[PDB]
Amino acid sequence: ASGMAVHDDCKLRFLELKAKRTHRFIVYKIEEKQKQVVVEKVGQPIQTYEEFAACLPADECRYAIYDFDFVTAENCQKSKIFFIAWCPDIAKVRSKMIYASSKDRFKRELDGIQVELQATDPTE
Ligand SMILES: CCCCCCCCCCCC[N+](C)(C)[O-]
C-alpha cells in the first residue's frame, strides 16, 4: 500500500553528471520490496556504448541517464541529456508496468532532461 519513492543518491548522481559532467551515464533500478528507485551503476566521464549497453540487463527493465555528447565540425563538444526507459521484451509484464507507471514520477526528480527514449532489444 506504499508508493514509489526515490533514493536521494539518484538526484545527487544526476546532479554531478549535469553540473560537472563526471559521469557518462547512470543506471537506475526499482527495488519493489523497498519501493524505491536506487542507483545501480554510475559510469566514468567517458564510457563506450558497449560498456553502457552491458549495464542494461537483457531480462530486466531499468531507467538510465546518458550524457550524449558529440563534436561539431568546428571541433566543438556539445551534449544532450538522454533519459532512457529500458524495457527488454522478456522482462515480466508486471515489472514493465511498474517501470512505466513510475517513469514520470521519477523523471520529475531529474530536471534537465533534453531527450526521452524508450528502448528495447529486438534480438531477444
Ligand atoms: C545514447 C544512445 C541511446 C541508445 C540506448 C539503447 C541501449 C540499448 C542497449 C541494449 C542492451 C543489450 N542487451 C540486451 C544485450 O543487454
From Swiss-Prot:
Question: What happens when you mutate residue 78 to A?
Answer: Reduces binding affinity to F-actin and actin-depolimerizing activity
- Highest taxon, organism lineage: Eukaryota
Q: Mind telling me which CDD domains this protein's record contains? A: ADF_cofilin_like (cd11286)
Residue runs in coiled coils: none
**GO: which molecular function terms?**
actin binding
Upon deletion of the gene, what happens?
Increased length of hypocotyls under dark-grown conditions.
What Pfam families does the record point to? Answer: Cofilin_ADF
- Record's Gene3D superfamilies? Severin
Q: What is this protein's tissue specificity according to the annotation? A: Expressed in vascular tissues of all organs.
Q: Which residues carry this modification: Phosphoserine?
A: 2
Instruction: From the Swiss-Prot or TrEMBL record, state where the protein is found.
Output: Cytoplasm, Cytoskeleton
Q: What is its main location?
A: cytoplasm
All copies of domain ADF-H, residue ranges = 1-124
Any Gene Ontology CC annotation: cytoplasm
Q: Which InterPro entries match?
A: ADF-H, ADF-H/Gelsolin-like_dom_sf, ADF/Cofilin
What is a biological process (GO) this protein takes part in? actin filament depolymerization
Q: Which UniProt keywords apply?
A: Actin-binding, Cytoplasm, Cytoskeleton, Phosphoprotein
UniProt modification remark: Phosphorylation at Ser-2 by CPK3/CDPK6 inhibits actin-depolimerizing activity.
Q: What functional role does this protein have?
A: Actin-depolymerizing protein. Stimulates F-actin depolymerization. Involved in plant development, cell organ expansion and flowering by controlling breakdown of thick actin cables. Severs actin filaments or bundles and promotes actin cytoskeleton disassembly. Binds monomeric actin (G-actin) with a marked preference for the ADP-loaded form and inhibits the rate of nucleotide exchange on G-actin.
User: What assembly does the database describe for this protein?
Assistant: Interacts with the 14-3-3-like protein GRF6/AFT1.
- Into which family does the record put it? Belongs to the actin-binding proteins ADF family.
Q: What is this protein called?
A: Actin-depolymerizing factor 1
Species: Arabidopsis thaliana
